């Protein structure tokens, strides 16, 4: 029932959480943020890291 990411779809596969505690979305699907492997260190979603 709950949806996440920029696509606003349910949880599926591997998801990564934005390290900004105040991120409005928080969880994103790896594919939606062009990731294949768990990043090392802090990770911020496109919105929080300043992308358009």
């Amino acid at each position: 029932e709950p949806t996440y990411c920029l696509c606003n779809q349910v949880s599926y596969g591997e998801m990564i959480g934005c390290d900004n505690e105040q991120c409005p979305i928080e969880w994103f699907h790896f594919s939606c943020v062009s990731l294949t492997y768990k990043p090392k260190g802090k990770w911020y979603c496109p919105k929080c890291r300043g992308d358009n």
Binding site: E14, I16, G17, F30, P39
Partner: peptide, 8 residues
């Protein structure tokens, strides 16, 4: 990073 595998 913080990641999780979808479960259930």
């Amino acid at each position: 990073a913080r990641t999780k595998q979808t479960a259930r």
